[PDB]
Design a protein around this motif. Structure first.
Motif, PDB file in Angstrom:
ATOM      1  N   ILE D  37     -38.844 -60.802 -25.623  1.00 47.26           N
ATOM      2  CA  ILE D  37     -39.335 -61.227 -27.181  1.00 47.26           C
ATOM      3  C   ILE D  37     -40.808 -62.087 -26.954  1.00 47.26           C
ATOM      4  CG2 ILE D  37     -38.602 -62.985 -28.722  1.00 47.26           C
ATOM      5  CD1 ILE D  37     -35.792 -62.342 -28.019  1.00 47.26           C
ATOM      6  N   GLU D  39     -43.380 -61.242 -24.717  1.00 43.56           N
ATOM      7  CA  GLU D  39     -44.294 -60.379 -24.405  1.00 43.56           C
ATOM      8  C   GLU D  39     -44.560 -59.369 -25.684  1.00 43.56           C
ATOM      9  OE1 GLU D  39     -46.120 -60.527 -21.928  1.00 43.56           O
ATOM     10  OE2 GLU D  39     -47.317 -58.428 -22.046  1.00 43.56           O
ATOM     11  N   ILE D  40     -43.675 -58.943 -26.320  1.00 46.71           N
ATOM     12  CA  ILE D  40     -43.777 -58.348 -27.498  1.00 46.71           C
ATOM     13  C   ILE D  40     -44.633 -59.184 -28.901  1.00 46.71           C
ATOM     14  CG2 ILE D  40     -42.646 -57.052 -29.493  1.00 46.71           C
ATOM     15  CD1 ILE D  40     -40.779 -56.141 -27.062  1.00 46.71           C
ATOM     16  N   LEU D  43     -48.024 -59.111 -27.998  1.00 42.33           N
ATOM     17  CA  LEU D  43     -48.662 -58.012 -28.323  1.00 42.33           C
ATOM     18  C   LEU D  43     -48.951 -57.625 -29.638  1.00 42.33           C
ATOM     19  CD1 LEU D  43     -46.983 -56.023 -25.412  1.00 42.33           C
ATOM     20  CD2 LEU D  43     -49.467 -56.558 -25.372  1.00 42.33           C
ATOM     21  N   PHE D  44     -47.937 -58.091 -30.391  1.00 47.76           N
ATOM     22  CA  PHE D  44     -47.861 -57.908 -31.714  1.00 47.76           C
ATOM     23  C   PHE D  44     -48.818 -58.736 -32.427  1.00 47.76           C
ATOM     24  CE2 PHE D  44     -46.275 -59.771 -35.865  1.00 47.76           C
ATOM     25  CZ  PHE D  44     -46.590 -58.532 -36.618  1.00 47.76           C
TER      26      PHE D  44
END
Lengths: 60, 65, 65, 60
Positions: D37, D39-40, D43-44
């Motif tokens: 959660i 890392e995404i 990135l987002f």
């Protein structure tokens, strides 16, 4: 602009990797959960069969 | 009743509760997997939608220049 | 409006939907962990309750014989 | 009876092992979920920052 568009594309490739890896991870977890559910169900039935048999002997 | 009869009945009630919790959790896990698959597919779809629009604009600006 | 303005607005709506799904799934996972911990503790407790009653009866019958 | 009581006890030891192993497995899965959660989300936010910056340049 070219550098930032590449950076944007490199991040999107990293995102696509993360999403499919997590999707596969969830797929593996469900298979392991099902295996645990089967093993515990089997063990609970083994113990319950021995218990019911012994309880029947004591009562009778 | 005697202490043994009472404890054996308690044992039967415990085994009935265990059987119920096991099937409830097994059913709960199945509902989560359907929800997990739905969320992961929609988020991936949204990410590809945004990436497709970006690629379209990048290509359109390339024709412009 | 032009095709670029419309697509850029679509991109903003997609990013808003992605942000919402991510926080919703993150919150959903937190609720599951509290439920998982509750189920695993109760089932383990029930299993030990049944095992304690069994050990008691086995010990009581041992005194009897 | 002694043999069946041993069998009952051996099954209960197997059950106790399975339950604590699955409880630890669930503990590890939550930690991995939290890491995914984060890392995404990062990135987002990287991709969204590049997108918002580029969109601002095209508009202005």
């Amino acid at each position: 602009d070219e550098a930032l568009e590449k950076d944007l594309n490199d991040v999107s490739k990293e995102i696509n990797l993360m999403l499919s890896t997590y999707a596969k991870l969830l797929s593996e977890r469900a298979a392991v959960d099902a295996s645990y559910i089967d093993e515990i169900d089997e063990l609970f039935k083994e113990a319950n069969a021995i218990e019911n048999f012994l309880i029947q002997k004591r009562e009778f």
